């Protein structure tokens, strides 16, 4: 949707940090991102 | 914890004669100004 060069801050850990360590959230993230890379469409079925 | 609350305070002479209401508070147990501790009473359904 972007028509300009622009910076956006996001929070990729949502709110996991309340109850896990950042070691654990970085492990959850790179497993979620690795499975979206190996097969995108079947990975999205698991989340949705 | 039950005692980090503000305690209700009133004029003692008038309180023996009529219920005055809550007009003043005194401090319960000391903490830093920003730093509250929850109290057990807020976690218990009342009998009514």
């Amino acid at each position: 949707k972007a028509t300009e060069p622009q910076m956006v801050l996001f929070n990729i850990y949502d709110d996991w940090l309340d109850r896990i360590s950042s070691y654990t959230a970085f492990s959850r993230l790179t497993l979620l991102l690795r499975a979206l890379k190996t097969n995108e469409e079947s990975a999205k079925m698991i989340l949705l | 914890s039950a005692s980090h609350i503000l305690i209700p305070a009133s004029d003692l002479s008038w309180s023996k004669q009529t219920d005055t209401g809550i007009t003043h508070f005194r401090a319960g147990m000391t903490h830093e100004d920003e730093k509250l501790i929850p109290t057990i009473f807020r976690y218990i359904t009342t009998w009514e």
Binding site: Q6, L9 | L6, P8, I22, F25, L36, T39, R42
Partner: protein, 450 residues
């Protein structure tokens, strides 16, 4: 000729541009009155601008707008020192004429104009206080006091030794000399401001910085010739880097939600919970966001409690902006948020709002938004009305509730006007709730129509 022709309507339009600027000069319009003047040829229109400001000051309509008038002249003086040069010349002659005419109306028009020129560093001090000597040579006292009310601020900052001696001489008159009656309280009012220190005579348009105005403090006096160049106001014949980061994280709204939830959970009573919220002094634009957290904290409980209702009443009776955040939230809960809520959460909502409606912290007219219809009533919205009205019956009693439903004019609940299938719906609604006694007015209108 077309050259005598062109230079005349050019001379006409320059007249016809300055005079609507001078008539439309006011505060918060000085820089724009300076802008359209700067494109007009002030250097050629040099007495065209001088005659337009001197006549507009003197007309006695003005007198209020003098402090805006001299502020344009200071904008002129730093642009061109020669424009205010002749413009400071004529106002000296205007006073020296009208004082010898003894024209108290037109002198004090100029006398307020010259003092604000001194406040704007246009003229010197020596021109002002030598007027103050010729006024204090004779009586002229209704003129000279109105000068020293306005000019005595800066003048005691700059020339304080000579300006005290004027105060020293003027004080001799009030004590040891008989004078008129009505002028006497004017003379001692000038000494009343000396002890209150001139805080009612120093407000105006200092719209140049103390260096942005190139300081042309002209050292005139009223004892010299000023050449009276009226010959320019006639016609003559010229042969001449911020990085815009969009924030999607919304950590700020999460960190403010934790602060309010913790104020609530650390409190024994709702009187003591409202005291802590009132202590934080939340801004006006965040207060709708605070009523929203209080309700969402309350729906996380298993049951209703008097804590959230007692706390809510303390905020409404504090200040009328908290009243407004509760009237706004009641419409958000009914029109947007109804679909989101489970049936156990609609018990806590309807008892929360029905308790505030029955003790009149909300008007009965907040129920105006509710419309009972087959098509435009949510199933989860109808569960909200049942729980709100069961609470209204319990507190008031049924006979008192009929007084208030009659006093309000809420048509979506009790339609008496027509659309007989909607009159069927409402009577069928309220008898299912247990309120058939409320329905008896609508029951008459249906049997008439059928």
């Amino acid at each position: 000729d077309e050259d005598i022709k062109f230079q005349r309507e050019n001379w006409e339009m320059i007249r016809s541009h300055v005079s609507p600027i001078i008539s439309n000069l006011t505060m918060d319009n000085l820089q724009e009155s300076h802008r359209d003047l700067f494109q007009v040829n002030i250097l050629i229109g040099r007495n065209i601008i001088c005659k337009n400001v001197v006549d507009f000051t003197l007309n006695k309509q003005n007198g209020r707008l003098i402090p805006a008038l001299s502020a344009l002249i200071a904008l002129l003086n730093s642009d061109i020192p020669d424009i205010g040069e002749t413009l400071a010349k004529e106002l000296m002659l205007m006073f020296v004429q009208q004082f010898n005419r003894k024209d108290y109306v037109s002198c004090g028009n100029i006398l307020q104009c010259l003092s604000i020129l001194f406040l704007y560093d246009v003229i010197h001090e020596i021109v002002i206080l030598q007027i103050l000597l010729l006024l204090l040579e004779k009586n002229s006292l209704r003129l000279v006091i109105a000068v020293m009310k306005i000019c005595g601020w800066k003048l005691a900052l700059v020339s304080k030794k000579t300006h005290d001696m004027i105060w020293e001489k003027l004080r001799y008159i009030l004590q040891t000399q008989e004078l008129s009656s009505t002028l006497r309280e004017s003379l001692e009012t000038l000494f009343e401001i000396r002890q209150k220190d001139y805080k009612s005579g120093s407000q105006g348009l200092f719209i140049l910085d103390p260096t942005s105005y190139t300081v042309h403090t002209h050292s005139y006096i009223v004892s010299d010739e000023d050449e009276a160049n009226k010959e320019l106001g006639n016609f003559e014949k010229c042969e001449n880097s911020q990085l815009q980061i969009y924030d999607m994280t919304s950590t700020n709204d999460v960190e403010f939600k934790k602060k309010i939830y913790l104020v609530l959970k650390s409190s024994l009573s709702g009187d003591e919970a409202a005291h802590k919220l009132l202590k934080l002094k939340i801004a006006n634009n965040l207060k709708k966001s605070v009523v929203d957290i209080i309700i969402k904290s309350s729906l996380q409980e298993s049951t209703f409690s008097k804590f959230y209702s007692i706390l809510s009443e303390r905020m409404i009776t504090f200040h009328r902006s908290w009243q407004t955040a509760y009237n706004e939230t009641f419409e958000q809960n009914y029109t947007q948020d109804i679909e989101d809520y489970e049936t156990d959460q609609l018990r806590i909502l309807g008892k929360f709002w029905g308790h505030l409606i029955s003790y009149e912290f909300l008007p009965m007219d907040c129920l105006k938004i509710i419309k009972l219809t087959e098509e435009e009533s949510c199933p989860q919205g109808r569960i909200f009305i049942k729980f709100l009205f069961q609470e209204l019956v319990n507190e008031l009693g049924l006979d008192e509730l009929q007084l208030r439903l009659n006093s309000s004019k809420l048509d979506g609940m009790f339609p008496l006007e027509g659309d007989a299938e909607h009159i069927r719906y409402s009577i069928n609604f309220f008898t299912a709730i247990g309120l058939g006694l409320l329905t008896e007015d609508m029951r008459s209108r249906l049997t008439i129509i059928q």
